[PDB]
Amino acid sequence: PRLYFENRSKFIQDQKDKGINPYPHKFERTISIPEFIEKYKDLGNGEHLEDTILNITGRIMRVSASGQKLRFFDLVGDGEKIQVLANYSFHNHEKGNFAECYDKIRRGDIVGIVGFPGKSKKGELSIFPKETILLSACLHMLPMKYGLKDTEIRYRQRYLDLLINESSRHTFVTRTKIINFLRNFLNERGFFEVETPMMNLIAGGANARPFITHHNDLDLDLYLRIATELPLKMLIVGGIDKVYEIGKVFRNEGIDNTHNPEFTSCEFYWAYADYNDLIKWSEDFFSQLVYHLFGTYKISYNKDGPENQPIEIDFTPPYPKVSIVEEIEKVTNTILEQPFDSNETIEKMINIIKEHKIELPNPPTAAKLLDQLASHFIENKYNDKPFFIVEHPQIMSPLAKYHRTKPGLTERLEMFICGKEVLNAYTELNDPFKQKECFQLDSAFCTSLEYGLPPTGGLGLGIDRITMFLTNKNSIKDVILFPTMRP
Amino acid sequence: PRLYFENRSKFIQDQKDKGINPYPHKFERTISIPEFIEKYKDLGNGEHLEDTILNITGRIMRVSASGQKLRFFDLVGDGEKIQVLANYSFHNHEKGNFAECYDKIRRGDIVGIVGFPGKSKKGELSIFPKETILLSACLHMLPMKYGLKDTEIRYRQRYLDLLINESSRHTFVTRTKIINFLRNFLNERGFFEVETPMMNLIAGGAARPFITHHNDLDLDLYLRIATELPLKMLIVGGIDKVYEIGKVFRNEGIDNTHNPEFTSCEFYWAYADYNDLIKWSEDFFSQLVYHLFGTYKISYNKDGPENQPIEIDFTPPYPKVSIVEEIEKVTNTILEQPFDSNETIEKMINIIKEHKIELPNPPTAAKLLDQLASHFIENKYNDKPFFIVEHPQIMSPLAKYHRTKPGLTERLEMFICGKEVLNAYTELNDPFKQKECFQLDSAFCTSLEYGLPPTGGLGLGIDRITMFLTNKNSIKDVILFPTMRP
Ligand SMILES: NCCCC[C@H](N)C(=O)NS(=O)(=O)OC[C@H]1O[C@@H](n2cnc3c(N)ncnc32)[C@H](O)[C@@H]1O
Ligand SMILES: NCCCC[C@H](N)C(=O)NS(=O)(=O)OC[C@H]1O[C@@H](n2cnc3c(N)ncnc32)[C@H](O)[C@@H]1O
Numbered sequence: 001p002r003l004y005f006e007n008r009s010k011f012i013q014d015q016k017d018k019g020i021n022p023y024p025h026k027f028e029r030t031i032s033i034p035e036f037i038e039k040y041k042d043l044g045n046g047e048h049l050e051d052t053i054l055n056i057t058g059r060i061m062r063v064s065a066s067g068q069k070l071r072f073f074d075l076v077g078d079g080e081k082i083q084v085l086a087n088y089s090f091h092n093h094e095k096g097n098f099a100e101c102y103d104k105i106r107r108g109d110i111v112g113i114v115g116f117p118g119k120s121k122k123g124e125l126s127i128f129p130k131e132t133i134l135l136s137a138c139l140h141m142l143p144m145k146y147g148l149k150d151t152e153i154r155y156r157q158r159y160l161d162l163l164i165n166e167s168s169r170h171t172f173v174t175r176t177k178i179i180n181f182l183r184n185f186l187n188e189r190g191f192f193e194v195e196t197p198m199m200n201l202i203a204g205g206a207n208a209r210p211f212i213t214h215h216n217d218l219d220l221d222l223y224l225r226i227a228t229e230l231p232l233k234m235l236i237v238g239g240i241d242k243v244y245e246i247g248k249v250f251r252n253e254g255i256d257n258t259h260n261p262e263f264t265s266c267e268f269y270w271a272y273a274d275y276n277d278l279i280k281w282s283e284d285f286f287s288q289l290v291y292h293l294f295g296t297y298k299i300s301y302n303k304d305g306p307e308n309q310p311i312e313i314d315f316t317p318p319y320p321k322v323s324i325v326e327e328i329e330k331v332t333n334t335i336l337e338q339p340f341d342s343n344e345t346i347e348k349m350i351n352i353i354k355e356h357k358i359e360l361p362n363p364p365t366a367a368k369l370l371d372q373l374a375s376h377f378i379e380n381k382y383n384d385k386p387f388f389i390v391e392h393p394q395i396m397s398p399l400a401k402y403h404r405t406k407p408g409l410t411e412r413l414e415m416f417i418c419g420k421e422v423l424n425a426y427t428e429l430n431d432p433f434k435q436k437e438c439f440q441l442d443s444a445f446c447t448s449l450e451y452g453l454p455p456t457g458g459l460g461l462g463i464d465r466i467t468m469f470l471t472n473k474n475s476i477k478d479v480i481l482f483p484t485m486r487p
Numbered sequence: 488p489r490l491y492f493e494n495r496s497k498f499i500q501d502q503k504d505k506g507i508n509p510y511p512h513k514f515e516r517t518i519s520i521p522e523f524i525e526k527y528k529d530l531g532n533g534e535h536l537e538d539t540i541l542n543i544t545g546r547i548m549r550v551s552a553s554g555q556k557l558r559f560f561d562l563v564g565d566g567e568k569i570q571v572l573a574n575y576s577f578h579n580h581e582k583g584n585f586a587e588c589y590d591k592i593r594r595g596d597i598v599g600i601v602g603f604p605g606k607s608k609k610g611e612l613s614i615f616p617k618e619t620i621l622l623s624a625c626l627h628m629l630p631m632k633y634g635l636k637d638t639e640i641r642y643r644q645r646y647l648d649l650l651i652n653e654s655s656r657h658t659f660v661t662r663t664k665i666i667n668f669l670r671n672f673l674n675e676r677g678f679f680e681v682e683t684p685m686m687n688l689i690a691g692g693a694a695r696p697f698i699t700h701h702n703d704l705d706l707d708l709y710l711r712i713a714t715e716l717p718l719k720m721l722i723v724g725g726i727d728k729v730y731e732i733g734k735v736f737r738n739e740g741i742d743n744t745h746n747p748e749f750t751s752c753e754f755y756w757a758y759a760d761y762n763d764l765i766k767w768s769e770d771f772f773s774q775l776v777y778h779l780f781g782t783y784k785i786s787y788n789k790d791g792p793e794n795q796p797i798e799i800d801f802t803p804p805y806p807k808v809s810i811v812e813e814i815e816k817v818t819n820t821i822l823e824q825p826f827d828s829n830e831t832i833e834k835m836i837n838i839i840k841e842h843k844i845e846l847p848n849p850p851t852a853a854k855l856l857d858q859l860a861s862h863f864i865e866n867k868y869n870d871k872p873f874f875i876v877e878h879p880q881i882m883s884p885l886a887k888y889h890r891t892k893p894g895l896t897e898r899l900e901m902f903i904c905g906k907e908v909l910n911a912y913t914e915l916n917d918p919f920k921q922k923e924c925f926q927l928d929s930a931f932c933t934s935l936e937y938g939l940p941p942t943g944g945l946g947l948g949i950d951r952i953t954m955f956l957t958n959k960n961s962i963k964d965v966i967l968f969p970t971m972r973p
Contacts, residue, residue: 159724
């Protein structure tokens with residue numbers, strides 16, 4: 001109970017009162033636990049290297065019952081494990097009673113050890129101490145091997161999740177491996193990474209309620225970025241022809257499984273590229289990244305929870321392209337004539353929505369009805385492959401350049417994986433006269449457009465959702481180390 | 488005037504009325520201007536390769552036609568330039584009048600060229616067009632180099648600065664190279680990059696905060712002032728070498744080593760102490776400078792490019808100066824502990840008054856000690872970087888107590904020309920000794936109660952390091968879009 005904490009705390013003072021330092025300043029270890037496993041895993045059973053003295057550190061995770069002369073522990077570090085085998089005959093009795101010194105050790109204690117490497121008779125690789133020193137004590141009782149499935153402890157105290165549940169470490173290692181692979185993928189193709197402001201006087205290139213915060217001395221209100229699209233395109237104007245940013249953005253809406261207040265986005269802008277360049281980019285990149293992580297283009301994913309049978313997602317390129325308006329017009333068996341915000345085709349969409357018992361949009365704007373219609377009739381089209389929804393109407397894509405053969409449409413693409421969007425890209429609108437809100441946009445961006453934005457293609461990736469799919473998670477809370485929670 | 492803009496706009500609409508697209512969608516180029524220069528730079532003077540046909544794009548930066556059949560242009564991309572030599576005799580009259588088509592071009596227009604490589608008789612590397620298309624017009628007059636030394640246009644329209652001042656490009660390339668070098672340097676050493684949250688409930692981990700309201704939780708959050716706390720929690724969780732490079736926020740005054748957001752890199756290194764962190768700083772700064780410059784000694788105009796430069800040598804080791812001992816030596820006073828006693832407080836206020844230092848208005852001991860070091864120590868060395876070390880425990884509430892000198896901590900701070908670029912220490916890991924767990928929050932404190940190994944942490948100021956390494960004396964010159972008033 002809380003008695004355990006009280007008792008370990010008082011134990012700590014007792015050691016201080018005997019002039020022992022239960023938190024020493026520095027311990028020079030010679031080798032990591034992984035390095036140890038690598039160098040000594042091929043020893044023979046019962047074999048010892050009793051003249052090779054090592055200093056090693058780790059956390060005690062298992063304490064097995066005292067024999068008269070032998071003590072056994074599990075020691076872990078960097079997500080790996082060796083055994084401690086403390087034998088009375090090898091103990092340097094000059095530095096204290098064997099029994100009392102190893103009786104102090106508790107599960108969760110961090111120790112440093114002076115000893116030699118060797119194996120059990122049974123063959124277990126272990127370090128044989130001569131001396132072990134407490135280095136930092138764990139004052140509470142740690143959960144047991146499978147005792148930590150309570151989500152709240154894993155998110156409000158992720159150090160425990162990282163210590164107990166083997167998988168979580170792999171999940172965040174895989175997250176970093178993905179961001180590394182993305183950085184080096186853009187870097188090898190001549191792209192140039194930059195940092196643009198988190199605070200501005202306007203929210204950027206999407207639609208979302210912002211976070212407001214007050215700069216005091218300047219007595220102004222600033223808004224957290226909802227995207228990076230605008231300053232990065234300005235940098236394209238400045239002749240940084242391949243540019244990207246990997247960092248946080250903020251959107252002040254509701255938490256769910258695919259949506260967190262702050263999330264990690266990566267945007268890139270690519271001068272003289274277009275829609276088709278970006279299609280191939282996405283095919284290239286997801287296929288290579290999956291193959292880089294798994295040795296295959298096929299992975300398995302628990303779309304409907306770990307309680308249910310998973311599905312196979314195949315990242316083999318090319319992926320399918322589905323035209324949003326045409327495909328809605330084909331599934332619904334109706335025809336939507338432009339303008340899409342006609343009174344008549346707005347009412348046609350609203351009748352599709354009422355007839356299929358689909359919820360209707362808070363304001364029934366054409367863009368929001370088309371969005372809802374795609375959400376119900378397309379976005380779960382393919383669940384065994386990523387696919388692209390393409391050629392969105394101009395009324396849904398205020399910064400996408402107009403389609404070069406299909407009037408009213410844009411050269412835009414979104415990629416979906418199990419029906420959740422991971423990717424948003426288009427041929428960038430670069431005619432300042434056609435960006436008709438220059439008469440969530442600001443004059444600095446629009447003015448920059450008048451200096452000549454070359455024909456460019458831009459892409460934005462949801463890093464969190466991609467990580468979810470590649471680490472078999474159903475909630476964004478499992479790929480963010482410190483998800484934000486209600487108290 | 489603005490008349491130039493109005494006329495360029497009319498020109499655009501007139502091309503559109505004549506069925507010409509002045510913003511085509513896609514131009515498929517064969518080669519970049521850098522690749523062009525690298526590939527044809529050793530052609531002979533006056534030589535041509537008119538049977539190898541290239542597509543290339545760029546920004547037209549010079550438009551000095553001369554002759555009614557020869558037109559000369561400057562073309563830049565990716566920071567490099569070639570000449571465009573448009574000769575009537577190579578023009579494809581089938582795609583439009585030569586003169587008519589080339590009269591349209593203006594300084595700033597982005598264009599695509601179909602042509603062949605060669606050198607002029609003078610030897611100027613050039614693309615020779617058969618066809619030139621407008622891809623995106625520059626509707627404004629571009630300023631020339633002289634025109635852009637106004638600080639405000641460089642900060643308010645950095646695309647201009649990046650187009651006109653080739654200094655600027657180099658600066659920002661250098662900042663990215665610095666961050667690359669740092670990421671690679673940590674990764675090679677076993678370090679694990681993570682992201683920890685930008686908004687927290689606690690004000691921060693190390694100044695006033697930015698407040699903001701989270702709507703879906705009816706809550707107020709604070710932008711992080713440092714990454715120290717969650718990263719130490721990752722050490723508790725067994726990520727024994729961890730780091731983060733991102734923005735932190737400080738709601739304070741704008742001065743040219745101080746911006747509301749700036750880029751920090753903090754790492755935590757389990758089983759390392761103060762000494763490991765000194766050695767790390769020496770290795771990193773020496774190797775980084777050598778990586779960028781092929782030497783350890785750099786020039787830097789501390790007072791601007793108008794005054795004389797000074798030399799900084801980064802060859803290791805750097806000097807270590809112990810703060811209180813040094814203040815005591817210069818002031819010829821003895822500040823004995825506790826440093827917040829009335830007695831020593833008035834010694835320090837007497838020194839401030841006697842030397843006419845401004846007094847820190849909440850005159851705490853920590854503030855005073857800080858003001859004293861800033862006045863007597865912090866610009867001791869300006870020819871070499873140096874460390875101020877062993878700060879009093881009262882200035883360092885998360886630094887582990889000095890293992891031999893009572894009342895001090897195992898902390899270090901590195902200064903270059905008297906501005907601090909990193910702050911590091913042996914970490915305080917005894918929960919009982921962090922005497923607020925009864926700036927900090929309960930989450931961090933409890934996590935200390937689960938066992939923080941002996942650890943050493945370090946924080947770097949990325950912007951300031953870049954300032955010194957790109958010869959700037961203002962932070963706004965190393966930040967692409969510094970915040971200004973409208
Ligand atoms: N120039 C073309 C588009 C540029 C990027 C543009 N700013 C944009 O599309 N942003 S976006 O639609 O928000 O897409 C960002 C991606 O990030 C992900 N995303 C978006 N909102 C969230 C939220 N709320 N949580 C998590 N992930 C999110 C998802 O993958 C999106 O496709
Ligand atoms: N456990 C060790 C401490 C970790 C780092 C500690 N959190 C810290 O010192 N944070 S910091 O004070 O913000 O310092 C980080 C560095 O950032 C730089 N810095 C600090 N404030 C600013 C401001 N405002 N602008 C620019 N650069 C700044 C300076 O180089 C500092 O040494």
